């Protein structure tokens, strides 16, 4: 009886619900059940709730003051497409220690909010964000702890299609709040594969 941003099957067809073999204490509230193959299943209702909350939350910031971070390969394209639409700054690839706490570094910047792809892989960013006191928005999978995360978005943050649809929905809802024109499809946010289409 709950309204989803997109039809439930789209979410399921993307694999946002499929977690890993491991589940942390922090993620308990977001895990629906376990599957035969042993993979934990995240709650699509919960994810949909946080996407809506994160969108409204991120729309309140002036673009460049939002900094997305993702070292995970399949997250690059999605992060760049979210930044195109939203206007956020971003750092894909290796995060240079000091980017947020060393004014001397050339890459130094002062975002008001940091949004990482994985609190484990993008931990250097999370650490520095914490040191400065900047809120952290983080996509969290069953295996992630919500250590220094202020806004947890429970989802599979490893899947090519999972990342795509989540970054797409976030960007779409922010654009909708702004009354901003948005015409991208999910495929437009998906990492491109060698041998694939474009």
Curated annotation (Swiss-Prot):
GO cellular component: small ribosomal subunit
Keywords associated with the record: Ribonucleoprotein, Ribosomal protein
GO molecular function list: structural constituent of ribosome
Keyword Ribosomal protein: yes
Domain of life: Archaea
This protein's record includes keyword Heme: no
PROSITE patterns assigned to the protein according to its UniProt record, in alphabetical order: RIBOSOMAL_S2_2 (PS00963)
GO biological process: translation
CDD domains for the chain: RPS2
A Pfam short name: Ribosomal_S2
InterPro entries, per the entry: Ribosomal_uS2, Ribosomal_uS2_arc, Ribosomal_uS2_bac/mit/plastid, Ribosomal_uS2_CS, Ribosomal_uS2_euk/arc, Ribosomal_uS2_flav_dom_sf
NCBIfam families xref list: uS2_euk_arch (TIGR01012)
Family to which the UniProt record says this protein belongs: Belongs to the universal ribosomal protein uS2 family.
Entry protein name: Small ribosomal subunit protein uS2
Organism: Archaeoglobus fulgidus (strain ATCC 49558 / DSM 4304 / JCM 9628 / NBRC 100126 / VC-16)
């Amino acid at each position: 009886e709950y309204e989803y941003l997109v039809p439930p099957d789209d979410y399921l067809a993307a694999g946002v619900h499929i977690g890993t073999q491991i589940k942390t204490g922090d993620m308990k509230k977001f895990i629906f059940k376990v599957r035969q193959d042993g993979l934990y299943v995240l709650d699509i209702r919960k994810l949909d709730e946080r996407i809506r909350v994160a969108a409204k939350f991120l729309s309140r910031y002036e673009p460049s003051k939002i900094l997305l971070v993702a070292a995970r390969q399949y997250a690059h394209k999605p992060v760049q497409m979210f930044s195109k639409v939203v206007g956020s700054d971003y750092i894909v690839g290796r995060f240079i220690p000091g980017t947020l706490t060393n004014p001397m570094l050339s890459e130094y910047r002062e975002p008001e909010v940091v949004f990482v792809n994985d609190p484990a892989i993008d931990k250097q960013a999370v650490s520095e964000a914490t040191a400065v006191g900047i809120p952290v928005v983080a996509l969290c999978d069953s295996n992630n702890s919500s250590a220094d995360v202020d806004l947890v978005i429970p989802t599979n943050n490893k899947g090519r299609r999972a990342l795509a649809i989540v970054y797409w929905l976030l960007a779409r809802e922010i654009a909708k709040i702004r009354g901003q024109d948005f015409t991208y499809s999910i495929e437009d946010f998906e990492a491109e594969l060698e041998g694939g289409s474009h």
